[PDB]
Design a protein around this ligand. Structure first.
Ligand code: BLJ
Ligand code: BLJ
Ligand code: NA
Ligand code: NA
Lengths: 179, 179
């Protein structure tokens, strides 16, 4: 099945349902307090002001989502972008994150980004495997950088290189809008 | 013989003599516009509400400075802290930076952080060797992540481990006045 489409604020509810147990009971995310539905709604809208936000859907329900965000604040970094992907429990390994990425990555390239970074709390062999298969390269690991759920956690970064690190790059454009 | 003291907003114009050419003509900082003196005042003053900010003085004039800043926004990262040290061109480069860190690092340890991170625009043999002798470890490099002054630049990160990654860490305390 599976169709990828642009996310909407109305997807907040299913997205929150996917994301809340990840915040609650895993070190996948370094957030501590479960974000409300209303919060995820605002995160969707704000992200869309500049970046793609995507959902994967199967028979009308959201089974995963993906979005991009700013890699770092300072001007010279503006060709670097962060990517985030999540899949509902029980729908993993069925290729959903892969499909999300196969849409998100080309979108980012055409916007003007030169590289995308995925932050992965380690260990997570299934997430590493997926990024290795997609062609990301592991460029570094911040060891025991986070504390959550009674343990210290490594965070590795995986880089997808869009190429075209040419000599006169132009600033990336808005997904659908702003400058 | 160079002395280290905590910085004050009234040091802004002297700090700027150091920062301005770094911004205008090096990749040492990925900022592109020189902050106004008013901005520098607010930066120093804002950092101090929670973090140490230091200057190195030789014959009464600021020849270098250093400050800590938040590593990442998410709650689980609150024991990680970023460090930044800049030194004027000319004499005693390494000595100045070393003395700065010899004060900054122990201050951050006492405050309750578990690790500090320095980002280095690469190559920079002088800075790398300095971090290495201070006991930092190179944990990753973000290749071609920034574009500035007609080239793409890698940024490597060096980690200072304060130890004490125990099971019940208490949140870090504010440098002079609570966080
Ligand atoms: C291990 As993780 O929860 O993917 C940390 C990334 C977070 N967006 C931050 O920058 O603070
Ligand atoms: C190359 As560099 O100015 O050492 C990168 C750090 C920058 N402060 C940021 O995090 O935005
Ligand atoms: Na990190
Ligand atoms: Na970076």
């Amino acid at each position: 099945g599976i169709d990828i489409r642009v996310a909407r604020p109305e997807d907040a509810e299913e997205i929150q349902i996917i994301y809340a147990p990840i915040v609650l009971n895993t070190a996948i995310s370094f957030e501590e307090a479960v974000p409300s539905v209303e919060q995820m709604r605002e995160r969707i809208s704000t992200t869309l002001q500049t970046y793609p936000y995507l959902v994967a859907v199967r028979e009308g329900r959201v089974v995963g989502y993906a979005y991009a965000s700013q890699h770092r604040a300072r001007a010279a970094y503006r060709w670097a972008v962060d990517v985030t992907v999540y899949v509902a429990e029980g729908q993993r390994r069925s290729g959903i994150a892969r499909q999300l990425y196969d849409v998100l990555l080309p979108v980012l390239k055409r916007l003007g980004y030169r590289s995308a970074y995925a932050g992965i709390a380690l260990p997570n062999e299934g997430s590493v495997g997926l990024h290795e298969r997609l062609g990301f390269q592991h460029i570094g690991t911040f060891p025991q950088v986070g504390f959550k759920l009674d343990a210290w956690h490594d965070v590795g970064y995986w880089r997808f290189d869009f190429g075209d690190e040419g000599l006169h790059p132009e600033a990336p454009l808005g997904f659908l809008s702003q400058i």
